[PDB]
From Swiss-Prot, chain B:
SUPFAM superfamilies xrefs: Dehydroquinate synthase-like (SSF56796)
Gene Ontology molecular function: any one: glycerol-1-phosphate dehydrogenase (NAD+) activity
Listed name of the protein: Glycerol-1-phosphate dehydrogenase [NAD(P)+]
Organism: Methanocaldococcus jannaschii (strain ATCC 43067 / DSM 2661 / JAL-1 / JCM 10045 / NBRC 100440)
Cofactor(s) in the UniProt record: Zn(2+)
Length: 333, 328
């Protein structure tokens, strides 16, 4: 085991004011800040600020030598780009999310050049829930899709263990699955007044599970494959759909869950529960809401397995009619 | 705010990676706290101080940027304490695996919470060679997560204490896997799995910001025993894990009574302790039966922490439990 986790995690109103404090604790003196256009107001303690596009337009090294860490502030592009650059410079990364739409906040995954790959987990995570609470509702709702997908990811991971002898950690699996279960239970039973707070905790916890298992397995399975497949097709058919990753994964979760349910009667009804919790926080549950033609969903399901060399309930592949059947049995079309 | 380790290593040869890790953390001048037996592993230029020099008696330490604790539990705990005092990071390098102080943010009475070690470097080649007794006693520290978790739930339910189901389950599952391993294998990898378990259990504490997932009524029972050793001036050399394992057998029984769902649990725990040659009875432990009984009776008062013991155990109830469970 060689495991990298965060050193400091903060999740509270006002958190953004503690960046200084944390840098001091970590004995970090000169951070490079990676951020975006409309987050410059949260950056007013620092001096070296770079926008993520500068980096993304040339992903290649000896002009950053003076910096001892990187601080990513803002949305997902900001955090992912900052994480990437820290990895490249071999220095620690500090995650300061202003949104909470996915688990890149705390995870050691970089999703700049899909496929994703594994780097070090951020050394600190500073999640100001006063700021995150005011992020676009749509991004918060999409966070739900990212969390519920731990369920199918864990089911796929067990399946891969059983059927293919893949490395599996029961205690990471259960942690990741339970994080999502608690979040689902909260959205189904509360007034949702603390959702943002609990979403962030879930996203973060889910990040830790990944670090702890040294794999994205506890957080990503066939539902994510389905999502990547959708993305390919948006590009390949030049669609203009503004669809978010977590929205897509949530819907992938509904469906993949149903495939598991067929094989494992003990899980029957799980997909309806996931469906419910997504509805309850305003997250899409069908292609129409998501914005797609039915044929794209079907095609995406049929080509999900090929996306990555990762065993899942999809197995050797779905047929176009198994696909349709699933999508319609499932309410997605 | 949650403080966890940054780097955790569990492998054969791990001790050789101390420099590699210090460099990754940009630390340059560690003070090493250790014991006489463990100098053999202190193959480096760093200043070395023995834990008793500290325990018998601030500005001699200003030039150090971290503390590295190498050895047994006194070493790790004394090193953790001093790091906290100097406001510098602590690196845990255990040579034995008798308890979860290896990776926890706990200093130990009453124990208190500091930062979790910034790194944990557990060399399983070294740990494999530790005295059998100490490894067996690790089992007692792990199985006690089961009752700790049960007490936590209970306190949540009955007293609306702050509870994290995902932390609870993580801790409980760690112990379940370790129990399952010792009941079903040849134990050839026990030391390896015990260490992973002790470390995981440490992370659970850091993550919940509480010892709850790792420590409950069974630890109360242990602390009570300890008080009585001191208070009666007994010369018993009984280890913390050994005491907690026995506490776990008994406390699990209390939970079983109330929850038929848990039927058989205490015998499972007893079995797993037997399987690694850990004590399950007072006589193996070293004690008179009255000490056990008195310790049960006064366990709840030890700290303000609701458990299955609730308001307290009566002397008859205590005896009855201790004998129903084979401990006396
Ligand atoms: Mg996920
Ligand atoms: Mg324990
Ligand atoms: Zn995702
Ligand atoms: Zn303990």
């Amino acid at each position: 085991m060689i495991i990298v986790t965060p050193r400091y995690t903060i999740i509270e109103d006002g958190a953004i004011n503690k960046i200084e404090e944390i840098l001091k604790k970590l004995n970090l003196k000169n951070p490079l800040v990676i951020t975006g256009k409309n987050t410059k107001k949260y950056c007013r303690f620092f001096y070296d600020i770079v926008y993520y596009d500068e980096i993304l337009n040339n992903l290649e090294l000896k002009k950053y030598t003076a910096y001892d860490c990187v601080i990513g502030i803002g949305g997902g592009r900001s955090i992912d780009t900052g994480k990437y650059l820290a990895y490249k410079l071999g220095i620690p990364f500090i995650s300061v999310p202003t949104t909470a739409s996915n688990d890149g906040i705390a995870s050691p995954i970089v999703s700049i050049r899909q496929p994703s790959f594994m780097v070090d987990a951020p050394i600190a995570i500073i999640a100001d829930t006063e700021i995150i609470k005011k992020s676009p509702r749509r991004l918060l709702s999409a966070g739900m899709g990212d969390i519920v997908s731990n369920i199918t990811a864990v089911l796929d991971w067990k399946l891969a263990y059983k059927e293919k002898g893949e490395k599996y950690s029961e205690s990471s699996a259960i942690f990741s699955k339970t994080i999502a279960k608690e979040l689902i239970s909260y959205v189904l039973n509360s007034d949702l007044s603390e959702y943002h707070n609990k979403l962030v905790k879930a996203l973060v916890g889910s990040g830790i599970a990944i670090a702890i298992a040294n794999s994205s397995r506890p957080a990503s399975g066939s539902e994510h494959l389905f999502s990547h497949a959708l993305d390919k097709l948006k590009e390949e058919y030049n669609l203009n759909i503004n669809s978010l990753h977590g929205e897509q994964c949530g819907i992938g979760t509904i469906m993949m869950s149903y495939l598991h349910e067929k094989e494992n009667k003990k899980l029957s009804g799980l997909h309806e529960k996931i469906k419910m919790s997504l509805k309850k926080v305003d997250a899409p549950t069908t292609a129409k809401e998501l914005g797609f033609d039915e044929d794209i969903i079907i095609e995406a399901l049929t080509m999900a397995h090929k996306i990555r060399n990762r065993w899942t309930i999809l197995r050797d592949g779905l047929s176009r009619e198994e696909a349709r059947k699933l999508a319609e049995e499932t309410g997605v079309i």
